[PDB]
Design a protein around this ligand. Sequence first.
Ligand SMILES: [Mg+2]
Ligand SMILES: [Mg+2]
Ligand SMILES: [Mg+2]
Ligand SMILES: [Mg+2]
Ligand SMILES: [Mg+2]
Ligand SMILES: [Mg+2]
Ligand SMILES: [Mg+2]
Ligand SMILES: [Mg+2]
Ligand SMILES: [Mg+2]
Ligand SMILES: [Mg+2]
Ligand SMILES: [Mg+2]
Ligand SMILES: [Mg+2]
Ligand SMILES: [Mg+2]
Ligand SMILES: [Mg+2]
Ligand SMILES: [Mg+2]
Ligand SMILES: [Mg+2]
Ligand SMILES: [Mg+2]
Ligand SMILES: [Mg+2]
Ligand SMILES: [Mg+2]
Ligand SMILES: [Mg+2]
Ligand SMILES: [Mg+2]
Ligand SMILES: [Mg+2]
Ligand SMILES: [Mg+2]
Ligand SMILES: [Mg+2]
Ligand SMILES: [Mg+2]
Ligand SMILES: [Mg+2]
Ligand SMILES: [Mg+2]
Ligand SMILES: [Mg+2]
Ligand SMILES: [Mg+2]
Ligand SMILES: [Mg+2]
Ligand SMILES: [Mg+2]
Ligand SMILES: [Mg+2]
Ligand SMILES: [Mg+2]
Ligand SMILES: [Mg+2]
Ligand SMILES: [Mg+2]
Ligand SMILES: [Mg+2]
Ligand SMILES: [Mg+2]
Ligand SMILES: [Mg+2]
Ligand SMILES: [Mg+2]
Ligand SMILES: [Mg+2]
Ligand SMILES: [Mg+2]
Ligand SMILES: [Mg+2]
Ligand SMILES: [Mg+2]
Ligand SMILES: [Mg+2]
Ligand SMILES: [Mg+2]
Ligand SMILES: [Mg+2]
Ligand SMILES: [Mg+2]
Ligand SMILES: [Mg+2]
Ligand SMILES: [Mg+2]
Ligand SMILES: [Mg+2]
Ligand SMILES: [Mg+2]
Ligand SMILES: [Mg+2]
Ligand SMILES: [Mg+2]
Ligand SMILES: [Mg+2]
Ligand SMILES: [Mg+2]
Ligand SMILES: [Mg+2]
Ligand SMILES: [Mg+2]
Ligand SMILES: [Mg+2]
Ligand SMILES: [Mg+2]
Ligand SMILES: [Mg+2]
Ligand SMILES: [Mg+2]
Ligand SMILES: [Mg+2]
Ligand SMILES: [Mg+2]
Ligand SMILES: [Mg+2]
Ligand SMILES: [Mg+2]
Ligand SMILES: [Mg+2]
Ligand SMILES: [Mg+2]
Ligand SMILES: [Mg+2]
Ligand SMILES: [Mg+2]
Ligand SMILES: [Mg+2]
Ligand SMILES: [Mg+2]
Ligand SMILES: [Mg+2]
Ligand SMILES: [Mg+2]
Ligand SMILES: [Mg+2]
Ligand SMILES: [Mg+2]
Ligand SMILES: [Mg+2]
Ligand SMILES: [Mg+2]
Ligand SMILES: [Mg+2]
Ligand SMILES: [Mg+2]
Ligand SMILES: [Mg+2]
Ligand SMILES: [Mg+2]
Ligand SMILES: [Mg+2]
Ligand SMILES: [Mg+2]
Ligand SMILES: [Mg+2]
Ligand SMILES: [Mg+2]
Ligand SMILES: [Mg+2]
Ligand SMILES: [Mg+2]
Ligand SMILES: [Mg+2]
Ligand SMILES: [Mg+2]
Ligand SMILES: [Mg+2]
Ligand SMILES: [Mg+2]
Ligand SMILES: [Mg+2]
Ligand SMILES: [Mg+2]
Ligand SMILES: [Mg+2]
Ligand SMILES: [Mg+2]
Ligand SMILES: [Mg+2]
Ligand SMILES: [Mg+2]
Ligand SMILES: [Mg+2]
Ligand SMILES: [Mg+2]
Ligand SMILES: [Mg+2]
Ligand SMILES: [Mg+2]
Ligand SMILES: [Zn+2]
Lengths: 206, 70, 50, 87, 126, 119, 50
Amino acid sequence: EKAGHQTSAESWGTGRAVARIPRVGGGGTGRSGQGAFGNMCRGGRMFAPTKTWRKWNVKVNHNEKRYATASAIAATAVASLVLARGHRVEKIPEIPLVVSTDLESIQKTKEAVAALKAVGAHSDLLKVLKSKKLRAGKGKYRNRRWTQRRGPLVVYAEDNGIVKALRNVPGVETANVASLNLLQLAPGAHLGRFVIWTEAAFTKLD
Amino acid sequence: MKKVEDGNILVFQVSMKANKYQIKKAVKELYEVDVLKVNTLVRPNGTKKAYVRLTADYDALDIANRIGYI
Amino acid sequence: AISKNLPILKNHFRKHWQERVKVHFDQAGKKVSRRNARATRAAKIAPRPL
Amino acid sequence: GKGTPSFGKRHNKSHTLCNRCGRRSFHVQKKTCSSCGYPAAKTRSYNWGAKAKRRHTTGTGRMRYLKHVSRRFKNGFQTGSASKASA
Amino acid sequence: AKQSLDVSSDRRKARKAYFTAPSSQRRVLLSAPLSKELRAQYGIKALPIRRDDEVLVVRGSKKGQEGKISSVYRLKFAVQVDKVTKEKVNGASVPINLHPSKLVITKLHLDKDRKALIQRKGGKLE
Amino acid sequence: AGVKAYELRTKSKEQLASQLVDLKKELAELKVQKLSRPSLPKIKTVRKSIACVLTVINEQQREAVRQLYKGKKYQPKDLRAKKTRALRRALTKFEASQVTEKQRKKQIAFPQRKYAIKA
Amino acid sequence: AAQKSFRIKQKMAKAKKQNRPLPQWIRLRTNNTIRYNAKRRNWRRTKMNI
RNA sequence: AUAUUGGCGAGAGACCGAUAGCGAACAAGUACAGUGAUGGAAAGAUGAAAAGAACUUUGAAAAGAGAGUGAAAAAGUACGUGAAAUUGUUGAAAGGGAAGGGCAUUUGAUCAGACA
RNA sequence: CGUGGAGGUCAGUGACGAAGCCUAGACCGUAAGGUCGGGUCGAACGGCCUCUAGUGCAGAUCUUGGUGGUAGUAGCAAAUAUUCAAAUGAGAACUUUGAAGACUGAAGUGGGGAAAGGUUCCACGUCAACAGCAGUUGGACGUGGGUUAGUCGAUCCUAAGAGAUGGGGAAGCUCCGUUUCAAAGGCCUGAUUUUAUGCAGGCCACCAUCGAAAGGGAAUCCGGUUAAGAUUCCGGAACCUGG
RNA sequence: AAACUUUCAACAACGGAUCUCUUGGUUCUCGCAUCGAUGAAGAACGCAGCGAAAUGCGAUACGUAAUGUGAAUUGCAGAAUUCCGUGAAUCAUCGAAUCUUUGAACGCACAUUGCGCCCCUUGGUAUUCCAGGGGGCAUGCCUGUUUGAGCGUCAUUU
Ligand SMILES: [Mg+2]
Ligand SMILES: [Mg+2]
Ligand SMILES: [Mg+2]
Ligand SMILES: [Mg+2]
Ligand SMILES: [Mg+2]
Ligand SMILES: [Mg+2]
Ligand SMILES: [Mg+2]
Ligand SMILES: [Mg+2]
Ligand SMILES: [Mg+2]
Ligand SMILES: [Mg+2]
Ligand SMILES: [Mg+2]
Ligand SMILES: [Mg+2]
Ligand SMILES: [Mg+2]
Ligand SMILES: [Mg+2]
Ligand SMILES: [Mg+2]
Ligand SMILES: [Mg+2]
Ligand SMILES: [Mg+2]
Ligand SMILES: [Mg+2]
Ligand SMILES: [Mg+2]
Ligand SMILES: [Mg+2]
Ligand SMILES: [Mg+2]
Ligand SMILES: [Mg+2]
Ligand SMILES: [Mg+2]
Ligand SMILES: [Mg+2]
Ligand SMILES: [Mg+2]
Ligand SMILES: [Mg+2]
Ligand SMILES: [Mg+2]
Ligand SMILES: [Mg+2]
Ligand SMILES: [Mg+2]
Ligand SMILES: [Mg+2]
Ligand SMILES: [Mg+2]
Ligand SMILES: [Mg+2]
Ligand SMILES: [Mg+2]
Ligand SMILES: [Mg+2]
Ligand SMILES: [Mg+2]
Ligand SMILES: [Mg+2]
Ligand SMILES: [Mg+2]
Ligand SMILES: [Mg+2]
Ligand SMILES: [Mg+2]
Ligand SMILES: [Mg+2]
Ligand SMILES: [Mg+2]
Ligand SMILES: [Mg+2]
Ligand SMILES: [Mg+2]
Ligand SMILES: [Mg+2]
Ligand SMILES: [Mg+2]
Ligand SMILES: [Mg+2]
Ligand SMILES: [Mg+2]
Ligand SMILES: [Mg+2]
Ligand SMILES: [Mg+2]
Ligand SMILES: [Mg+2]
Ligand SMILES: [Mg+2]
Ligand SMILES: [Mg+2]
Ligand SMILES: [Mg+2]
Ligand SMILES: [Mg+2]
Ligand SMILES: [Mg+2]
Ligand SMILES: [Mg+2]
Ligand SMILES: [Mg+2]
Ligand SMILES: [Mg+2]
Ligand SMILES: [Mg+2]
Ligand SMILES: [Mg+2]
Ligand SMILES: [Mg+2]
Ligand SMILES: [Mg+2]
Ligand SMILES: [Mg+2]
Ligand SMILES: [Mg+2]
Ligand SMILES: [Mg+2]
Ligand SMILES: [Mg+2]
Ligand SMILES: [Mg+2]
Ligand SMILES: [Mg+2]
Ligand SMILES: [Mg+2]
Ligand SMILES: [Mg+2]
Ligand SMILES: [Mg+2]
Ligand SMILES: [Mg+2]
Ligand SMILES: [Mg+2]
Ligand SMILES: [Mg+2]
Ligand SMILES: [Mg+2]
Ligand SMILES: [Mg+2]
Ligand SMILES: [Mg+2]
Ligand SMILES: [Mg+2]
Ligand SMILES: [Mg+2]
Ligand SMILES: [Mg+2]
Ligand SMILES: [Mg+2]
Ligand SMILES: [Mg+2]
Ligand SMILES: [Mg+2]
Ligand SMILES: [Mg+2]
Ligand SMILES: [Mg+2]
Ligand SMILES: [Mg+2]
Ligand SMILES: [Mg+2]
Ligand SMILES: [Mg+2]
Ligand SMILES: [Mg+2]
Ligand SMILES: [Mg+2]
Ligand SMILES: [Mg+2]
Ligand SMILES: [Mg+2]
Ligand SMILES: [Mg+2]
Ligand SMILES: [Mg+2]
Ligand SMILES: [Mg+2]
Ligand SMILES: [Mg+2]
Ligand SMILES: [Mg+2]
Ligand SMILES: [Mg+2]
Ligand SMILES: [Mg+2]
Ligand SMILES: [Mg+2]
Ligand SMILES: [Mg+2]
Ligand SMILES: [Zn+2]
């Protein structure tokens, strides 16, 4: 907020054949004479300099926020939607996909990947991994270099190992049923995540 | 090198902090030599030059190469 | 500077108000600190309650 | 003749060098420095002159001593010696 | 994923700490993995390169060449080998700067300390 | 080459002083040589050696004095701890811990009790 | 000027010493980006202000 | 428990991207102006690597022409790309006191599609 | 319609060439624009649904930078003036030397200094920039050398003035006062012959200090010498001050 | 018909947009409490084998000591004993020193490298004159020590 204004430039007023923006005074340096302050000036202040007291966060009615997360859960059955979303589930048994409560006790990554596969997550796991591209923007040097798709979201009732076993496989995400989160249920505001539920989890639901 | 050959005189770059006294004693000590008088001056790079005349008993040229330079 | 059928407003922004804007971006942060403090203090205070 | 012939006579100094800040702001007839204020115990500075301060505050120089205080702080102001070991 | 609060994934901080790393720091980044054979031999994967180890280029245009490391040009982040050089046009000869991550070590020059290192890293030595 | 302190510290008081006078002739000579020559880096290792000796000559004189002032009011201010000017004038642990006779009786009589809730 | 305080003579000395071309060997240094001495001063073109 | 555009250490961003962002991504509060208080810039990018062009030839030299290096000199310390204004050369065309524009067709040049 | 960034997606494009830039070549749209070929190029980038804004230029005597026509144009005309030949050099209207013609005319275009500059002095080398033609020359450029004091100046003294101090004002930065309603200091020796300086006379009460390279003021001259220093060095001959 | 002007294109100029880059900037958040008469912040001048700067340092001067590491530094020259080691290093750490001239800045001054006094010591035939070496001398205020001032004032002499 001090930028553009670190000068003592006055306008020269009229009668010197020259526009009336403020000008850096003094001499001997090339900066002096130059247009000051104004938003069209090289090194001027910008127009309506951005302030931090801009609204950043947004308030949503709790119930309305539930309505959303519910809908999004409802929609993770409904295989068309799940399919529409990316999510390679052409060849999983049934939907909702519920898997043995034993899943939550897996400590070993390689074991966790093995499980997800047997249950049918293999083409989705392959679709992440198969999709790592460089972020196209300038984003790729503001701590966002790579890009990729979203894997399945493994929901559980109790973390007896599964969050760390799974925490390193590309695109796979975990949640506890008690929480359960719209940003993951409908990534990008597109309904239809591929949830793989444990039994424990599936029945905590009610 | 000429004042040495012709004038029986040793030129030293000398401490800026030193005076004719301290220059004279220092030559006398560090060289056996006896000093007749000491002229000094500040060079134009801020360093001092001492024109040291030895008494007639010493050959400054002789000193010069028994100190090393030449 | 008066027109339409609007309610008469009283927005007090005639001092250099921008110099005194407190935004609570540290809401999140203080809460944690506030938590770590109590965890620190429960610990210090041996079995006593807080 | 108020312009260039008068400039012809500019050959006397209003200010020399200032012992304390080294600056050719030492007003000879006034014996004080338009910049740093010497010989006032305090240093000249004003809050309307921010660049001016920025141009001179702690940090713009060597910090021959202050440099080291937060090393020294970091180690709780140790005295004594470091000992020894292997490798 | 990083999990600590005293490590940073920040690209800018990363690149700074690389390029402005002191000599002592560069000794470690300038590591080379051991040859398949040495790795059984001392039971140990890689090591900070040093000025008389024996080495095989296994990447790049000099892939296949070998020699004795003749400098660690820590300043240039690069290791020179007596035996892998550029013949110039005036028939002067000039070192190629090679990267130790693109070498493999074939005989460690050994020290009281070298062994002590190899030991410290859970390895064994013949 | 270049002299090493831990060896100088075994040498005697006036071995060190004489060491010094040698190194200075050494330097003096080198300086004459330097200006008859394209370069003369030996000079460096001689003048870091004069450093080292002075360092170590001054090292011993200092712990001479430091020790014979050890454990009395008043020692030269440049052997007193340095710390920080404020620190240096903070109250001592003693002065700070200091407590009113009345205050003590109370501390003793009604101290902060350890206790727990349950039953 | 021409009969001077030592303080002035000294500054003048330092000015002389500062008044030489870029020592060329620096150009050969690894990463060197200095091509020429960019603080050169000339008695005719620019005054010392003492 | 509160404060904090300073200081020491840290982790960050739907922030800026070299006329932007701090004035300063660089020997920047520098170079430079001013008696002084103060004012205060411009300026980043060869290549993976200098491999920075041995040698020959024309020249007083700078250089040119060959050669050479290189993945490339349509990268040669004037150096990534290299727009525009504006300029040279080549080619084509028009022009009786501006030029440029609209509808339309001759003429020249140029080009698509589609037959089966 | 288009742009910078963001969530999702197409497991989208790409070193077998991304992006960008060129292109009186092609195609779609009424249009904002979109698509392709070819050339150039070198590391990245796009389509769709959504999110977001420092989001679209011809103008503001707009900002910064770059570029034209003007134009090889105005002009380079004050201060009397130039000329022959040699030498050097790639190159000579311009450098060097010889010759000649002039000028300044001691109120100087002479010989020195003060302020100010600060190495410009001198030597060697030397022409890319600079010296509004030139350049082999230079107060330029590169490399070095050079400033010698008992007597010359500063230094000491006081001038107008300035300015600490006991003080008195003032919220305070500080203002006033300068010998000012101040307990304001140091000299000659004697006493010492434990011993080095305490006391024994007595005077003197003057109250800081800074302020002149033209004012006041202790004392050096002639000859010779250097590429460049000289009342400074060498030589001879003196003089002042203190001891 | 040239030349000239003008349009378009190729190649070459001028210029430095554009695209891609980024050890910088900006804003947020977390942790922490440390300048100075024990001379600070700041200034000036110096210091390298070969540096003008930037960075660093102070006549011990791009550094001395200590400690950790365990072999560089590098533009060139160099040491060379320094590589199974009280040991490389323009390394890291840093506890110990050096720290010119200065600055609140303190013997007095200061457009002056200007001018005193005191102590110890050294040289000159020297308590006193001169020279070298080391160590000292500001101000307000507090506690205290010592020497004193005042018919302010108490007592005790004979
Ligand atoms: Mg503002
Ligand atoms: Mg105009
Ligand atoms: Mg700006
Ligand atoms: Mg882009
Ligand atoms: Mg993508
Ligand atoms: Mg003779
Ligand atoms: Mg003299
Ligand atoms: Mg109306
Ligand atoms: Mg309000
Ligand atoms: Mg108002
Ligand atoms: Mg805040
Ligand atoms: Mg509570
Ligand atoms: Mg006027
Ligand atoms: Mg003027
Ligand atoms: Mg005046
Ligand atoms: Mg005043
Ligand atoms: Mg003062
Ligand atoms: Mg300051
Ligand atoms: Mg390791
Ligand atoms: Mg490399
Ligand atoms: Mg060493
Ligand atoms: Mg103390
Ligand atoms: Mg001038
Ligand atoms: Mg902050
Ligand atoms: Mg964070
Ligand atoms: Mg860009
Ligand atoms: Mg900028
Ligand atoms: Mg922008
Ligand atoms: Mg700027
Ligand atoms: Mg940069
Ligand atoms: Mg400039
Ligand atoms: Mg580039
Ligand atoms: Mg560029
Ligand atoms: Mg490069
Ligand atoms: Mg060529
Ligand atoms: Mg290729
Ligand atoms: Mg190419
Ligand atoms: Mg091109
Ligand atoms: Mg190229
Ligand atoms: Mg070249
Ligand atoms: Mg280019
Ligand atoms: Mg045509
Ligand atoms: Mg037409
Ligand atoms: Mg037509
Ligand atoms: Mg749109
Ligand atoms: Mg958009
Ligand atoms: Mg933006
Ligand atoms: Mg076109
Ligand atoms: Mg087409
Ligand atoms: Mg192509
Ligand atoms: Mg392309
Ligand atoms: Mg590239
Ligand atoms: Mg949208
Ligand atoms: Mg805008
Ligand atoms: Mg428009
Ligand atoms: Mg425009
Ligand atoms: Mg315009
Ligand atoms: Mg213009
Ligand atoms: Mg012409
Ligand atoms: Mg003409
Ligand atoms: Mg005219
Ligand atoms: Mg004339
Ligand atoms: Mg002529
Ligand atoms: Mg002539
Ligand atoms: Mg005549
Ligand atoms: Mg006449
Ligand atoms: Mg006359
Ligand atoms: Mg003349
Ligand atoms: Mg003269
Ligand atoms: Mg001058
Ligand atoms: Mg000359
Ligand atoms: Mg020329
Ligand atoms: Mg000139
Ligand atoms: Mg000319
Ligand atoms: Mg010319
Ligand atoms: Mg010169
Ligand atoms: Mg010179
Ligand atoms: Mg005199
Ligand atoms: Mg004097
Ligand atoms: Mg006063
Ligand atoms: Mg005086
Ligand atoms: Mg006088
Ligand atoms: Mg006089
Ligand atoms: Mg004479
Ligand atoms: Mg001479
Ligand atoms: Mg002369
Ligand atoms: Mg004489
Ligand atoms: Mg005589
Ligand atoms: Mg006498
Ligand atoms: Mg790159
Ligand atoms: Mg940042
Ligand atoms: Mg945080
Ligand atoms: Mg350096
Ligand atoms: Mg070195
Ligand atoms: Mg050790
Ligand atoms: Mg270091
Ligand atoms: Mg010292
Ligand atoms: Mg003083
Ligand atoms: Mg002094
Ligand atoms: Mg008292
Ligand atoms: Mg008493
Ligand atoms: Zn000042």
